[PDB]
């Protein structure tokens, strides 16, 4: 029974256990962790079940939750599944990890859980409650269905805007230039359905995740140590008002969570 978000461990102790080889790559990983350790004290290992990008981002977003974001507060959000599925029947090709009711229940849960965290009186109580939330398997995976649906919705908006000659974030031009992702239908069948199952997110889909939940995602990419990509931000130039969450990716294949002293369980 893998833990969703493992208990925090001292970051250099974690590094030491994980990278023991006498090789340039191990040395690079250790140097990367050293630099991360200047700003973060601990690491929580995130479960690598192909939901990791969503789990890590959402855990960080919700565990820091001081307000319910307006986009999540909006009543219209609850009308979205019926609005979209009625309009685009191909959305019924959604693979679950009826449809309108199931997605709606997921979005309702996301809103309710996030609001419950935001309404707590102390940051400590919020952190503890968020930890417990990510030990309820069923509820947790429902949250990721909500997030995947928000990614699909945002992709539809950007696609339709782009097709009308309207201004769009540039990543969306690249997202839909991919041969397996030329339209929202292909994005769903070839990329999103696989999320949490047989495949995770590409870098261009990290942008889409950031826009879906309106959080800026800062990633320490240890493999890019000593280059300008060592700290990579999704999206590159985000709205100033989006909260920032930080992840670590050793070599672009999985995302764990770095933790500040002021974020510690103890």
């Amino acid at each position: 029974g893998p833990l969703s978000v493992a208990p925090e461990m001292d970051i250099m102790d974690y590094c030491k256990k994980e990278w023991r080889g006498n090789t340039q790559k191990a040395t690079c990983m250790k140097m990367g962790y050293e630099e991360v350790s200047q700003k973060f004290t601990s690491i929580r290992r995130v479960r690598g079940d192909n939901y990791a990008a969503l789990r890590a981002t959402l855990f960080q977003a919700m565990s820091q939750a001081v307000g319910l974001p307006p986009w999540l507060q909006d009543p219209e959000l609850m009308l979205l599944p019926e609005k979209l599925i009625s309009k685009y029947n191909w959305i019924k090709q959604w693979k679950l990890g009826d449809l309108v009711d199931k997605i709606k229940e997921s979005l309702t849960l996301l809103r309710k859980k996030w609001a419950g965290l935001a309404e707590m009186r102390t940051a400590e109580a919020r952190q503890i409650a968020c930890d417990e939330l990510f030990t309820n398997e069923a509820e947790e995976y429902s949250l990721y269905e909500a997030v995947k649906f928000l990614m699909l919705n945002r992709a539809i908006e950007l696609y339709n805007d782009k097709e009308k000659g309207k201004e769009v974030p540039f990543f969306s031009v690249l997202l839909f230039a991919r041969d397996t992702s030329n339209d929202p239908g292909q994005l769903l069948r070839n990329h999103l359905n696989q999320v949490g199952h047989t495949g995770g997110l590409e870098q261009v889909e990290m942008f889409l995740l950031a826009y879906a939940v309106r959080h800026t995602i800062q990633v320490y990419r240890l493999s890019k140590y000593n280059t300008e990509e060592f700290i990579t931000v999704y999206p590159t130039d985000p709205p100033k008002d989006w909260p920032v969450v930080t992840l670590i990716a050793e070599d672009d294949r999985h995302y764990n969570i770095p933790v500040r002293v002021c974020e510690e369980t103890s």
Binding site: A177, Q203, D251, R253
Partner: protein, 146 residues
């Protein structure tokens, strides 16, 4: 002539190329400079995914043209490997990763030489040139080291 290749980080790579160079050539240059395997690379220009066998001229790419690099590498997968000692190690991997790449990672993490490594999944010895997906090794599968 000079062309630019921009990543989804706005990092810009400058390449010296010729009009008759192919997209395959360009990916090879990107591998040389960035260490990115050609099979992970997509190059996009004017909203089109460029094909390996066509030339820059074929795509009207000229001096100062900017291509965009959009990688296929996905994040979010772990597998487990049990060593000859009995220790369990956790690797961060991609379904397209080769067995050879996995053995190299075991060396980086544990110091075990790839030449000494025999990996088993579902009774099968795994061949170096094949990918995790070729063997239907999924997230949180366990491989055995002998």
């Amino acid at each position: 002539m000079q062309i630019f290749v921009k990543t989804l980080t706005g990092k810009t790579i400058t390449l010296e190329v010729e009009p008759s160079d192919t997209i395959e050539n360009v990916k090879a240059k990107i591998q040389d400079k960035e260490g990115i395997p050609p099979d992970q690379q997509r190059l996009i220009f004017a909203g089109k995914q460029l094909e390996d066998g066509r030339t820059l001229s074929d795509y009207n790419i000229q001096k100062e043209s900017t291509l965009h690099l959009v990688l296929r590498l996905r994040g979010g997968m772990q597998i487990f490997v049990k060593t000859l000692t009995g220790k369990t190690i956790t690797l961060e991997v991609e379904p397209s990763d080769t067995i050879e790449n996995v053995k190299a990672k075991i060396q980086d993490k544990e110091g075990i030489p790839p030449d000494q490594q025999r990996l088993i999944f579902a009774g099968k010895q795994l061949e170096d040139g094949r990918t995790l997906s070729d063997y239907n090794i999924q997230k949180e599968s366990t491989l055995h080291l002998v």
